[PDB]
């Protein structure tokens with residue numbers, strides 16, 4: 234897992250997210266859907282949207298983006314001791330919405346991209362390596378729970 238210094242840096246840049254959680258959610262999802270259009274098919278509410286303008290206009294998309302990033306900052310703040318928080322997320326993403334592990338990789342890349350673009354002074358080379366490892370840990374722990382739940386992610 235991560236050292237103390239690594240966790241510090243993950244929690245530092247995460248504070249800059251908290252200051253506008255919705256706006257970050259929107260940019261995350263738009264980056265995800267534009268880079269990887271097949272992920273958009275997973276969201277029944279707004280899978281019919283075609284353009285970035287439509288995606289910025291959607292109130293549904295904005296709310297969904299806020300929920301993901303809020304659930305993720307909860308997990309990161311546990312600095313790896315996130316079993317309790319990870320359980321419900323694993324369950325819903327393995328049963329209700331079947332999210333392959335690969336799509337969790339894509340959204341990790343989207344988050345890393347938005348952080349780099351919006352907060353470069355809080356997100357240099359070391360902090361990016363730290364967030365990369367923290368999001369690997371998250372995906373790896375989720376994959377372990379997929380297996381028990383009977384979803385081949």
Ligand code: HEM
Pocket residue numbers: 272273275276277278297300301302304305321322325326330332336337340341
């Ligand atoms: C950082 C990774 C992610 C986190 C922390 C996360 C968290 C959440 C949470 C908290 C919810 C609402 C409650 C629930 O259903 O459990 C949710 C819903 C959802 N997630 Fe995820 N999620 C992640 C990644 C993804 C990815 C990559 C996809 C699809 C490509 C996805 C698809 C969905 C869908 C379809 C819903 C239902 C959306 C709705 O209310 O319209 N998730 N997510």
Ligand SMILES: O=N[O-]
Pocket residue numbers: 297298301340
């Ligand atoms: O809705 N979570 O990407």
Ligand SMILES: O=N[O-]
Pocket residue numbers: 264265268342343344346
């Ligand atoms: O969105 N990943 O570059």
